[PDB]
Every structure is written in C-alpha cells, then in structure tokens.
A and B are shown apart, each in its own frame.
Chain A
Amino acid sequence: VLTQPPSASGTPGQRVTISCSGSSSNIGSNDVSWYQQLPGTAPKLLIYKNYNRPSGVPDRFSGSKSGTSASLAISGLQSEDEADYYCSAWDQRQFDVVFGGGTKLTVLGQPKAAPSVTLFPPSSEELQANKATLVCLISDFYPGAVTVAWKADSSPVKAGVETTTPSKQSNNKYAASSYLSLTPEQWKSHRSYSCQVTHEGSTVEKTVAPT
C-alpha cells in the first residue's frame, strides 16, 4: 500500500517534489518506478529502478529513494507537466506490484481571468419532443472554480440544475457547463431565464427568452 499526497503545486520554472510513503516489504527493499498520466492519456514510465530515466524522458525529472520513502523531483516546471504522478514498487509480502494513489500536480501562475458565458435556449426540435433544456457554457476562467445560479424572471430556480466540475482547457484556462431542465410549460410561463456565473466575487450574466 503506497501512500502519496493527493495534490502538489508549483509555478513555472520551479521545482516540485512528489513524495511516496511505503514499508519495508515494498519501497524499503524494492526498486521504485514512476508514471506520469496526462489527462485522457495512458500512463508513461518516467523513472524505473529508483533513479533511471528511459530514453526520451528529460533530465528535469529525477527519482530518489530514502528508506521506506521515494521522491520524484520535477525541476523547470512547465504547464504541460500538469498530470497525475504514480509511484510503484514490487511488494514481497503481498507478492504483487503495488501503486500509490497518485498525486494530481497543478501548475499555477496563470493570470486571473473572468468567465466568458454563452447561454442557449431550448431548440424548436427539443420543444416538439416535450422537453426543454437551457445550456449555460462557461469558459476562459482562471482560477478553476465557479458558482452558478439560475433565475426565471429574476427569481431563483434551484430544481432541475446539473452542473459539471471545472475542467482545464488546452489554453490552461478552465471550462464548466450548467444545464437547466424544464417542462415546455415552465419555459413559456416566464418572460426570461437567466444563468448567473460567479467567479472570485464577480458575477457574469446571460439571459435568454422564448420567441
């Protein structure tokens, strides 16, 4: 059972150490390996046999081991390094290869950015199928955390809301999605529906209405 802190962080060009805690049966007496898993990709071997790098793994990554603990040092930190890092070792007692639970490395230093908000009303096609979904799209925000509230004629609507977790974009900014399900009767019974997005104390509003 290898234990790693769930998160790590650093700004560009810094050094970040990812740590791995074990026991005499695994790390204490076995060769350690490290894997990098970028979002939506397979793991990649970074280090094997404690400190060795396979061909193509840059010098920036270094592995070490001291007793029942092992460390992955990431120097010259790039935004592309934002990934999950896993330690691994054979365990003689369990008689199996074991993994850490992984550490989610976050790269900081992105300037603060307010959310861009696009709000869509239900399509005619959907209204014909006796359904109504309001689509609130939130993008280009940093830090990656947002609060969503929906309104119908300036009064709060809490029921039938589904909101995604924030996710990082290709450009290192964050995106989120919020959906408002209504019956076509609710959509029409109101003059307008609104999606209010709060990011670091500031609110960005979009409004939509039936034709």
Chain B
Amino acid sequence: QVQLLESGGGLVQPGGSLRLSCAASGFTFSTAAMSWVRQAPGKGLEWVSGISGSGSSTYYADSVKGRFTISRDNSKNTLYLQMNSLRAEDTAVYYCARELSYLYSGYYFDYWGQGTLVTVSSASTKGPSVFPLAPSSGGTAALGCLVKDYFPEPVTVSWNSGALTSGVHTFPAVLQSSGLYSLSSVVTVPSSSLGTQTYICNVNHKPSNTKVDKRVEPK
C-alpha cells in the first residue's frame, strides 16, 4: 500500500549541508501536503517544515528558517529537505509524513516514513574493529563477535549470511567515554557442532563503508 521511503541521512560536519529525500508509493502524491518531523535523541517530536501539494506554499519552524529548504517533484513522487549550515542541535531522526491541516480535520500526520538519522558532529566517521568472542570448553557453547569502537550508529550483524537466526542476541551498543560505540552479538550453538560447523559474523557499518565477515573459531 502506502509507502514513504527515506534516504540521504548520515554524518555531517558542523556548518555542513545535507539533502534528505522521501520517495512515495500507493497514494496520489500530488494531492498530499507533505512534512518533515524530527526527533532529537531520547526526546519527542518537532515539526520542521511543510509543503503544499502543488509546492506553491512552504512553511518552516522558527529554528530552521533560512537554513532548510523544502521541495517536491510530483512527477517523481519525491519530497526533499535541503538542509544548510547544520548545527549540533539539528542531530535527530527526520521522518517525512503526509499531513492533514484543514480546519475540518485538525492538524495530524496520517502516514509516516521510517526516518533517517542525521548526525551533526565534528568527530569523523570510524569503522569498527571486529573481534571474535571464541567459545570456551557442557551441551551448548556461547560464541560471538565484538564490534568495537565505531561512529556513528548503526552497525548491523547477521550470522552465516542469514542462515543462522535463532538464538542470536545482538546487544544494544555501549557509548564509551571516547565517544565511540561498541556492541556485541552472541549465538548459543551445540558444542558438538564446533569445529565441524563454521560460524561467521557479518558486520556492516554503512557510514564508514566497513564490511567484515569474521570467522569465529574455538580455542
């Protein structure tokens, strides 16, 4: 049905610029008023900008006037947010949403996108170092991978290219004092399958374009 797929999000230096996009499907885009709504980490929602169906009228929150520009391509079913002179407090997940704001409807957002995280930091992207967490010498063996010192989030971990899913516990990342994240992924497997069966954790970190397939062997 209705889809709003966002992209363009990522890490940017303070004062930097970024172009967010939102592709729509399953409703006639040109008829819809569209908006960007952001959410700062562990905070609530804040409307950023809105645009009419035609593109004739654009509106912006006070904190982003003269920095952000909203636009749309009705032929392309796409909404854009050109963000300039980005600031640290502009760090948030930005969702695109179809809005209703008639006097008859009230002001609400019926369809939402998934969001793209925008990070405005002076720290440079850092790819993780991937270390195996070797199983040691009773029925089942716990084994895993340590995804150390990366920035920004997210990192994705799959095991044996998606052939191993059950009993896989990928832990939420710790934010270390250094400003770098670290996470662990663990899988409990039959001890007897160690050595005979191969275990590989596939780690990807899109911000730094890191891709590791680390084989986890016992001691």
In-complex Cβ contact of B47 among A33, A86, A96 (8 A): A96
Q: Which range holds the interface residue count of chain B?
A: 35 or more
Find residues 98-113 in chain B having any chain A CB closer than 8 Å to their own CB: 100-101, 105-110, 112-113
- Can you identify 30 A-B contacts, CB atoms within 8 angstroms? A30-B107, A31-B106, A32-B106, A42-B113, A43-B95, A43-B112, A44-B112, A45-B108, A48-B108, A48-B110, A86-B45, A89-B106, A89-B107, A96-B47, A97-B101, A99-B46, A100-B44, A101-B43, A118-B142, A123-B132, A129-B129, A133-B131, A133-B148, A135-B133, A135-B146, A164-B173, A175-B169, A175-B172, A177-B174, A177-B184
The reply to whether A42 and B112 form a contact with Cβ atoms under 8 Å apart is yes
Find residues 92-124 in chain A having any chain B CB closer than 8 Å to their own CB: 96-97, 99-102, 118, 120, 122-123
Asked if B164 CB lies within 8 Å of chain A CBs, one says: no
Cα–Cα, bound, A139→B144 (Å): 15
Cα–Cα, bound, A96→B46 (Å): 10
Dominant SS among interface residues on chain A: strand
Cα–Cα, bound, A89→B108 (Å): 8
The reply to whether A123 and B134 form a contact with Cβ atoms under 8 Å apart is yes
Smallest Cβ distance from B205 to chain A, in angstroms? 18
In-complex Cβ contact of B184 among A88, A102, A135 (8 A): A135
How many residues on chain A are close to B (CB under 8 Å)? 44
Find residues 108-162 in chain A having any chain B CB closer than 8 Å to their own CB: 118, 120, 122-123, 125-126, 129, 133, 135, 137, 139, 162
Cα–Cα, bound, A129→B177 (Å): 20
